[PDB]
Design an enzyme around this catalytic site. Structure first.
Site, PDB file in Angstrom:
ATOM      1  N   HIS A 199      -5.455  -5.841  21.566  1.00 46.27           N
ATOM      2  CA  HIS A 199      -5.273  -4.795  20.749  1.00 46.27           C
ATOM      3  C   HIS A 199      -5.955  -4.998  19.328  1.00 46.27           C
ATOM      4  O   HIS A 199      -6.167  -3.970  18.431  1.00 46.27           O
ATOM      5  CB  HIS A 199      -3.677  -4.574  20.304  1.00 46.27           C
ATOM      6  CG  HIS A 199      -3.462  -2.868  20.088  1.00 46.27           C
ATOM      7  ND1 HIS A 199      -4.282  -2.200  19.148  1.00 46.27           N
ATOM      8  CD2 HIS A 199      -2.404  -2.268  20.386  1.00 46.27           C
ATOM      9  CE1 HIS A 199      -3.596  -1.083  19.184  1.00 46.27           C
ATOM     10  NE2 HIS A 199      -2.524  -1.211  19.978  1.00 46.27           N
ATOM     11  N   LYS A 249      -0.140  20.692  28.910  1.00 43.75           N
ATOM     12  CA  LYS A 249      -0.522  21.679  27.648  1.00 43.75           C
ATOM     13  C   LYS A 249      -0.301  23.057  27.663  1.00 43.75           C
ATOM     14  O   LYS A 249      -0.299  23.640  26.812  1.00 43.75           O
ATOM     15  CB  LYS A 249      -1.917  21.149  27.203  1.00 43.75           C
ATOM     16  CG  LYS A 249      -1.996  19.634  26.726  1.00 43.75           C
ATOM     17  CD  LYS A 249      -3.245  19.377  26.433  1.00 43.75           C
ATOM     18  CE  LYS A 249      -4.494  19.202  27.496  1.00 43.75           C
ATOM     19  NZ  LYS A 249      -5.860  18.955  27.015  1.00 43.75           N
ATOM     20  N   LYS A 280       1.955  29.264  21.696  1.00 45.40           N
ATOM     21  CA  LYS A 280       1.479  28.926  20.229  1.00 45.40           C
ATOM     22  C   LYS A 280       2.217  27.871  19.596  1.00 45.40           C
ATOM     23  O   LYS A 280       2.612  27.650  18.508  1.00 45.40           O
ATOM     24  CB  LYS A 280       1.501  30.116  19.447  1.00 45.40           C
ATOM     25  CG  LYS A 280       0.826  31.399  19.936  1.00 45.40           C
ATOM     26  CD  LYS A 280       0.592  32.590  18.889  1.00 45.40           C
ATOM     27  CE  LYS A 280      -0.114  33.838  19.589  1.00 45.40           C
ATOM     28  NZ  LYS A 280       0.130  34.875  18.955  1.00 45.40           N
ATOM     29  N   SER A 292       2.107  23.208  19.259  1.00 48.44           N
ATOM     30  CA  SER A 292       1.266  22.257  19.511  1.00 48.44           C
ATOM     31  C   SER A 292       1.743  21.295  20.670  1.00 48.44           C
ATOM     32  O   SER A 292       3.034  20.998  20.664  1.00 48.44           O
ATOM     33  CB  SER A 292       1.277  21.446  18.306  1.00 48.44           C
ATOM     34  OG  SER A 292       0.849  20.031  18.686  1.00 48.44           O
ATOM     35  N   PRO A 293       1.115  21.161  21.889  1.00 53.34           N
ATOM     36  CA  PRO A 293       1.603  20.362  22.853  1.00 53.34           C
ATOM     37  C   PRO A 293       2.297  19.114  22.357  1.00 53.34           C
ATOM     38  O   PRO A 293       3.395  18.640  23.055  1.00 53.34           O
ATOM     39  CB  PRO A 293       0.511  20.409  23.717  1.00 53.34           C
ATOM     40  CG  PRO A 293      -0.587  20.953  23.400  1.00 53.34           C
ATOM     41  CD  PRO A 293      -0.117  21.602  22.303  1.00 53.34           C
ATOM     42  N   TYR A 310       8.339   6.279  15.436  1.00 56.23           N
ATOM     43  CA  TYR A 310       7.161   6.105  15.279  1.00 56.23           C
ATOM     44  C   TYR A 310       6.278   6.623  16.096  1.00 56.23           C
ATOM     45  O   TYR A 310       6.354   6.905  17.412  1.00 56.23           O
ATOM     46  CB  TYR A 310       6.752   4.440  15.089  1.00 56.23           C
ATOM     47  CG  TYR A 310       5.219   4.389  15.123  1.00 56.23           C
ATOM     48  CD1 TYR A 310       4.504   4.329  16.262  1.00 56.23           C
ATOM     49  CD2 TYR A 310       4.505   4.058  13.865  1.00 56.23           C
ATOM     50  CE1 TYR A 310       2.943   4.042  16.259  1.00 56.23           C
ATOM     51  CE2 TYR A 310       3.131   3.714  14.104  1.00 56.23           C
ATOM     52  CZ  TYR A 310       2.471   3.633  14.975  1.00 56.23           C
ATOM     53  OH  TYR A 310       1.273   3.435  14.941  1.00 56.23           O
ATOM     54  N   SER A 361      -3.823   8.745  14.239  1.00 50.22           N
ATOM     55  CA  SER A 361      -5.365   8.285  14.068  1.00 50.22           C
ATOM     56  C   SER A 361      -6.034   8.580  12.574  1.00 50.22           C
ATOM     57  O   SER A 361      -5.791   9.758  12.337  1.00 50.22           O
ATOM     58  CB  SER A 361      -6.144   8.649  15.094  1.00 50.22           C
ATOM     59  OG  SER A 361      -7.758   8.282  14.962  1.00 50.22           O
ATOM     60  N   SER A 366       3.191   6.924  21.300  1.00 48.53           N
ATOM     61  CA  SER A 366       1.772   7.210  20.953  1.00 48.53           C
ATOM     62  C   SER A 366       1.446   8.177  22.266  1.00 48.53           C
ATOM     63  O   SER A 366       1.728   8.208  23.339  1.00 48.53           O
ATOM     64  CB  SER A 366       1.049   5.858  21.088  1.00 48.53           C
ATOM     65  OG  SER A 366      -0.239   6.047  20.930  1.00 48.53           O
TER      66      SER A 366
END
Length: 591
Positions: free
Chosen positions: A314, A390, A397, A399-400, A423, A427, A525
């Site tokens: 990582h 998605k 309308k 956000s997936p 959390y 990016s 994530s």
């Protein structure tokens, strides 16, 4: 000729971050804890106080560095983290099962995979990798140049990372490990041209047949131990010249390919979840765990049964860039070979031997014991949400990613009966050398939404309004985080700046509220990929979960992890609630 350099990572205004911090705490701390924290925050930001001094310090730092946070982050998040990298740091990825049924098929695939990486490497070596964009803005591509020909190196105090890609004469070999035995495989001819797929296949056959033995010491398993233990064993291991030469070859290799044994009896529906374990940690001291070098930045894994994937160190990069490299490689394996290199004699790949002494044997046994304990405590499940991807949220309308995140908040509240510090990785690549920052999925809007969702005294109309408000609010936090407007990295910076300024830890960081805010029961994530794969990692706290997902058009691949030592958590249970939360949200909106 080149386009303009990327903007520098910003330092956000002090009051902005502090106000956002206070708002993010509201749903996960008590009323009195919040009241006390507000007091400390006001003390911290008072005119002429500690906060303003530290803030000016960071602004100064930003004027003197390429990225005010880059060095501190690499050091604090990875180099100084001393827990084993296995499970706790290095993320794993699982690919769809391959259809090969015999050795020929297995090695043909491994050869194509290898050729694919070398093709990608052409862009790294020539610095011609195309720049990715997000919302019309260029992203930093530095992480991609840290993946190949690199390796983490243990250190007694803290670790270091080596990148041999731009040295005088960069390495021209990969390393292949089979039944715990490592081999140095040159993948370029003397004139610098590639070996092609056919030639690589021929060399892999030699490697395979030169490592049929199954009773060799799993030297590689030493890399799975606590970093202080490995630093000690590493120093002992390289005292011998031959061992040092072998270790150096592995460290310098472009990447590593692991030729894995097929895991234990299937045990039916738990197949995918068990393969995830194989990709993340190897399965065990008696399995596949010793068929690795966890310090190596990139390790591809190909098992006899068709199970394939990878595990990456990582410190070098984040999940998105890794799976993007994977997509490129997989896409390459599907194309027909256009040019076969001329038929010429090929040398015998060099076996990298290890001279084992009683001391080294003792370290190997200790590493096996440590890893077994680690693996036995890991609870991981993979769930393919086939109902939709998605497509549905987009049709509404919404956000997936935000939709999925709110579904997870709903699932968690339904099990726990309260919200938790959450959390989600953001990016920061729009900025030079940017890595990540935090998105705080638990909010007052999300809390209000989950509290009303199952309340029969609330109208369907209001539930829909609250759902959309929570999703839209999350998306807002997401977009601001990506633009360098979140507050978590900023607060870490103020804390580190205080250390550099020789001042005691400011009270806001020793406050119970901060401890709660930084103890992520849900660490998540989104790692999107064109390939139908999924990434996974262990939880960041003993009583938390690690959740990762790849949203496709009509389905979503989910990974959920937990620790068995915490009786209150169970990955399969959270997965079940998550599946129903997603379905319930679609049902509510579609009515």
């Amino acid at each position: 000729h080149h386009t303009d350099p990327l903007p520098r990572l910003p330092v956000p205004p002090l009051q902005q971050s502090l106000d956002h911090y206070l708002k993010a705490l509201q749903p996960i701390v008590s009323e009195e804890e919040w009241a006390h924290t507000k007091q400390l925050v006001d003390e911290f930001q008072a005119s002429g106080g500690v906060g303003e001094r530290l803030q000016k310090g960071l602004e100064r730092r930003a004027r003197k560095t390429e990225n005010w946070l880059s060095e501190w982050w690499l050091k604090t998040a990875y180099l100084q983290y001393r827990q084993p990298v296995v499970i706790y740091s290095s993320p794993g990825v699982m690919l769809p099962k391959q259809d090969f049924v015999d050795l020929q098929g297995q090695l043909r695939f491994a050869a194509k995979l290898i050729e694919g990486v070398l093709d990608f490497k052409v862009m790294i070596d020539n610095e011609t990798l195309p720049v990715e964009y997000l919302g019309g803005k260029p992203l930093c591509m530095n992480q991609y140049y840290q993946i190949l020909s690199s390796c983490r190196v243990p250190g007694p105090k803290q670790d270091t990372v080596s990148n041999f890609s731009k040295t005088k004469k960069p390495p021209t070999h990969i390393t292949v490990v089979h039944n715990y035995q490592f081999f140095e495989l040159d993948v370029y001819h003397s004139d610098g041209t590639p070996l092609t797929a056919d030639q690589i296949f021929v060399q892999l056959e030699k490697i395979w047949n030169s490592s049929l033995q199954t009773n060799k010491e799993p030297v590689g398993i030493l890399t799975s131990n606590h970093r202080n233990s490995w630093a000690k064993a590493y120093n002992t291991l390289i005292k011998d010249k031959v061992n040092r030469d072998s270790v150096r070859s592995i460290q310098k290799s472009i990447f590593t390919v692991c030729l894995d044994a097929t895991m234990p009896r299937v045990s039916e529906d738990v197949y995918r979840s068990h393969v995830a374990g194989q990709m993340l940690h190897g399965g065990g001291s008696r399995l596949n765990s010793g068929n690795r070098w966890f310090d190596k930045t990139l390790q591809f894994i190909v098992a006899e049964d068709g199970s394939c994937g990878l595990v990456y160190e990582h410190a070098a990069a984040e999940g998105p860039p890794i799976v993007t490299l994977l997509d490129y490689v997989i896409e390459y394996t599907k194309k027909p070979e256009l040019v076969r290199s001329p038929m010429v004699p090929l040398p015998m790949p060099k076996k990298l031997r290890f001279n084992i002494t009683p001391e080294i044997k003792s370290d190997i046994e200790k590493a096996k014991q440590n890893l077994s304990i680690m693996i036995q405590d890991l609870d991981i499940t993979v769930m393919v949400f086939h109902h939709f991807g998605k497509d549905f949220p987009k049709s509404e309308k919404l956000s997936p990613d935000a939709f999925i995140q709110m579904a997870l908040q709903l699932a968690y509240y339904r099990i726990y009966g309260q919200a938790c510090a959450t959390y989600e990785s953001a990016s920061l690549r729009m900025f030079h050398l940017g890595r990540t920052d935090t998105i705080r999925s638990a909010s007052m809007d999300s809390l209000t939404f989950v509290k009303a969702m199952d309340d029969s005294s609330v109208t369907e109309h209001q539930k829909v309004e609250l759902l959309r408000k929570a999703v839209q609010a999350h998306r807002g936090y997401t977009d601001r985080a990506i633009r360098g407007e979140a507050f978590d990295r900023h607060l870490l910076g103020l804390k580190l700046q205080a250390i550099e300024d020789l001042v005691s830890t400011p009270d806001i960081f020793m406050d119970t509220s901060y401890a709660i805010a930084m103890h992520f029961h849900l660490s998540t994530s989104q790692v999107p990929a064109k390939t139908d794969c999924v990434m996974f990692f262990g939880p960041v706290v003993p009583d938390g979960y690690g959740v990762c997902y790849n949203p496709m058009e009509a389905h979503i691949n989910f990974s959920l992890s937990a620790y068995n030592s915490c009786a209150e958590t169970n990955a399969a249970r959270l997965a079940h609630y998550l599946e129903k939360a997603l379905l319930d949200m679609r049902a509510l909106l579609q009515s």
